[PDB]
Amino acid sequence: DYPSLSFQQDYVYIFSSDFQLSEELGVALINALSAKEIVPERLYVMLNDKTISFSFISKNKKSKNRVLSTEKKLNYKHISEYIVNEIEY
Amino acid sequence: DPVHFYETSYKYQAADSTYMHDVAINVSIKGNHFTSDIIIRELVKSENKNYYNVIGHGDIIQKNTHQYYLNFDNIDVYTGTNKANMKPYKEPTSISSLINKSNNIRVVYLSEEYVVVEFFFYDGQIITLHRY
Ligand SMILES: C[C@H](CCC(=O)NCCS(=O)(=O)O)[C@H]1CC[C@H]2[C@@H]3CC[C@@H]4C[C@H](O)CC[C@]4(C)[C@H]3C[C@H](O)[C@]12C
Ligand SMILES: C[C@H](CCC(=O)NCCS(=O)(=O)O)[C@H]1CC[C@H]2[C@@H]3CC[C@@H]4C[C@H](O)CC[C@]4(C)[C@H]3C[C@H](O)[C@]12C
């Protein structure tokens, strides 16, 4: 009942039925986090129709988990910026 | 049979409104039985704060190495505006529908310190739980 793993690179795991969106989001995440010198142990992301969720696992094995519901689909740039901001702060 | 504990927290936000949940999850598993405690703080602009305490227990069923199912025997819902005095609350549809039904949990990664799962909240959510 859940999307399959569609993009996996470095520490990023994206579960989504949309390959283009998965890869675009995954690369945007790695670019933005590395630029801020943030290197997660792992970063899991799930893209549903109406819901986005992610789990950020820090170097110290502590986790930050978030869910974002949206009535209209968001582009990879907005999703990336949201995730990075939640991780950053 | 040893008891294993799983704990996590998450924040829920809505892109189209001010609704927010702050949620702590505590789950204990012993054999094929589990007890779950879900503590929710619910916020929104047009209404004052609100807490929910959701206590349940049931059977956890292993299908694969990565596919589990939770089937609740019972769930109790308590609510209140102060965590000090909570009181029983009639189960909403989104709770009562979980009873005597097998709810999907898919493990995507397992370590000795944490587990990563896709589970059924909000019809699909990924989360990491710390192993105790
Ligand atoms: C993400 C897609 C699955 C979507 C889907 O339908 N999921 C089941 C839903 S449902 O059960 O039907 O409801 C899958 C289907 C085909 C895949 C490509 C296959 C060639 C190539 C192989 C390389 O190794 C990696 C890159 C590569 C381009 C792959 C990227 C991605 O992985 C693709 C697009
Ligand atoms: C009933 C509550 C208040 C709803 C509300 O504020 N009504 C007024 C607005 S309205 O005008 O009437 O629409 C809501 C608020 C938070 C919810 C939990 C969130 C986690 C989890 C998500 C899963 O997907 C289903 C089970 C789950 C435990 C949920 C159970 C229940 O649903 C909870 C307690």
JSON list of N, CA, C and O in Angstrom, two decimals, chain B residues 3-6 26-30 33-37 60:
[
{"chain": "B", "resi": 3, "resn": "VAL", "atom": "N", "xyz": [10.55, -8.34, 26.03]},
{"chain": "B", "resi": 3, "resn": "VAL", "atom": "CA", "xyz": [9.80, -7.19, 25.56]},
{"chain": "B", "resi": 3, "resn": "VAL", "atom": "C", "xyz": [10.76, -6.26, 24.83]},
{"chain": "B", "resi": 3, "resn": "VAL", "atom": "O", "xyz": [11.87, -6.00, 25.31]},
{"chain": "B", "resi": 4, "resn": "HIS", "atom": "N", "xyz": [10.34, -5.78, 23.67]},
{"chain": "B", "resi": 4, "resn": "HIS", "atom": "CA", "xyz": [11.10, -4.80, 22.90]},
{"chain": "B", "resi": 4, "resn": "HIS", "atom": "C", "xyz": [10.27, -3.53, 22.77]},
{"chain": "B", "resi": 4, "resn": "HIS", "atom": "O", "xyz": [9.07, -3.59, 22.48]},
{"chain": "B", "resi": 5, "resn": "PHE", "atom": "N", "xyz": [10.91, -2.38, 22.98]},
{"chain": "B", "resi": 5, "resn": "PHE", "atom": "CA", "xyz": [10.25, -1.09, 22.97]},
{"chain": "B", "resi": 5, "resn": "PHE", "atom": "C", "xyz": [10.71, -0.27, 21.78]},
{"chain": "B", "resi": 5, "resn": "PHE", "atom": "O", "xyz": [11.88, -0.30, 21.40]},
{"chain": "B", "resi": 6, "resn": "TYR", "atom": "N", "xyz": [9.77, 0.47, 21.19]},
{"chain": "B", "resi": 6, "resn": "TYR", "atom": "CA", "xyz": [10.04, 1.35, 20.06]},
{"chain": "B", "resi": 6, "resn": "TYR", "atom": "C", "xyz": [9.42, 2.71, 20.35]},
{"chain": "B", "resi": 6, "resn": "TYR", "atom": "O", "xyz": [8.24, 2.79, 20.69]},
{"chain": "B", "resi": 26, "resn": "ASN", "atom": "N", "xyz": [4.88, 5.38, 21.51]},
{"chain": "B", "resi": 26, "resn": "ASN", "atom": "CA", "xyz": [5.58, 4.38, 22.31]},
{"chain": "B", "resi": 26, "resn": "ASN", "atom": "C", "xyz": [4.91, 3.04, 22.07]},
{"chain": "B", "resi": 26, "resn": "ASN", "atom": "O", "xyz": [3.71, 2.90, 22.29]},
{"chain": "B", "resi": 27, "resn": "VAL", "atom": "N", "xyz": [5.69, 2.06, 21.60]},
{"chain": "B", "resi": 27, "resn": "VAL", "atom": "CA", "xyz": [5.18, 0.74, 21.28]},
{"chain": "B", "resi": 27, "resn": "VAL", "atom": "C", "xyz": [6.05, -0.30, 21.98]},
{"chain": "B", "resi": 27, "resn": "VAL", "atom": "O", "xyz": [7.28, -0.22, 21.93]},
{"chain": "B", "resi": 28, "resn": "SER", "atom": "N", "xyz": [5.40, -1.27, 22.62]},
{"chain": "B", "resi": 28, "resn": "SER", "atom": "CA", "xyz": [6.08, -2.42, 23.20]},
{"chain": "B", "resi": 28, "resn": "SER", "atom": "C", "xyz": [5.57, -3.69, 22.51]},
{"chain": "B", "resi": 28, "resn": "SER", "atom": "O", "xyz": [4.37, -3.84, 22.28]},
{"chain": "B", "resi": 29, "resn": "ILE", "atom": "N", "xyz": [6.50, -4.59, 22.20]},
{"chain": "B", "resi": 29, "resn": "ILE", "atom": "CA", "xyz": [6.18, -5.82, 21.49]},
{"chain": "B", "resi": 29, "resn": "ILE", "atom": "C", "xyz": [6.73, -7.00, 22.28]},
{"chain": "B", "resi": 29, "resn": "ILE", "atom": "O", "xyz": [7.91, -7.00, 22.66]},
{"chain": "B", "resi": 30, "resn": "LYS", "atom": "N", "xyz": [5.89, -7.99, 22.54]},
{"chain": "B", "resi": 30, "resn": "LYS", "atom": "CA", "xyz": [6.28, -9.22, 23.23]},
{"chain": "B", "resi": 30, "resn": "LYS", "atom": "C", "xyz": [5.61, -10.38, 22.52]},
{"chain": "B", "resi": 30, "resn": "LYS", "atom": "O", "xyz": [4.37, -10.48, 22.53]},
{"chain": "B", "resi": 33, "resn": "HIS", "atom": "N", "xyz": [2.20, -10.00, 20.41]},
{"chain": "B", "resi": 33, "resn": "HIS", "atom": "CA", "xyz": [1.31, -9.01, 21.02]},
{"chain": "B", "resi": 33, "resn": "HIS", "atom": "C", "xyz": [2.04, -7.69, 21.15]},
{"chain": "B", "resi": 33, "resn": "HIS", "atom": "O", "xyz": [3.27, -7.65, 21.31]},
{"chain": "B", "resi": 34, "resn": "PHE", "atom": "N", "xyz": [1.28, -6.60, 21.09]},
{"chain": "B", "resi": 34, "resn": "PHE", "atom": "CA", "xyz": [1.86, -5.26, 21.18]},
{"chain": "B", "resi": 34, "resn": "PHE", "atom": "C", "xyz": [0.93, -4.36, 21.99]},
{"chain": "B", "resi": 34, "resn": "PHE", "atom": "O", "xyz": [-0.29, -4.54, 22.00]},
{"chain": "B", "resi": 35, "resn": "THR", "atom": "N", "xyz": [1.53, -3.37, 22.64]},
{"chain": "B", "resi": 35, "resn": "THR", "atom": "CA", "xyz": [0.81, -2.30, 23.30]},
{"chain": "B", "resi": 35, "resn": "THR", "atom": "C", "xyz": [1.34, -0.98, 22.76]},
{"chain": "B", "resi": 35, "resn": "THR", "atom": "O", "xyz": [2.56, -0.80, 22.66]},
{"chain": "B", "resi": 36, "resn": "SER", "atom": "N", "xyz": [0.44, -0.07, 22.41]},
{"chain": "B", "resi": 36, "resn": "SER", "atom": "CA", "xyz": [0.82, 1.21, 21.82]},
{"chain": "B", "resi": 36, "resn": "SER", "atom": "C", "xyz": [0.21, 2.35, 22.61]},
{"chain": "B", "resi": 36, "resn": "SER", "atom": "O", "xyz": [-0.94, 2.27, 23.06]},
{"chain": "B", "resi": 37, "resn": "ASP", "atom": "N", "xyz": [1.00, 3.41, 22.78]},
{"chain": "B", "resi": 37, "resn": "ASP", "atom": "CA", "xyz": [0.54, 4.64, 23.42]},
{"chain": "B", "resi": 37, "resn": "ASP", "atom": "C", "xyz": [0.92, 5.80, 22.52]},
{"chain": "B", "resi": 37, "resn": "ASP", "atom": "O", "xyz": [2.11, 6.02, 22.26]},
{"chain": "B", "resi": 60, "resn": "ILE", "atom": "N", "xyz": [0.47, -8.33, 16.75]},
{"chain": "B", "resi": 60, "resn": "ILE", "atom": "CA", "xyz": [1.39, -7.99, 15.67]},
{"chain": "B", "resi": 60, "resn": "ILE", "atom": "C", "xyz": [1.71, -9.27, 14.92]},
{"chain": "B", "resi": 60, "resn": "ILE", "atom": "O", "xyz": [2.08, -10.28, 15.53]}
]
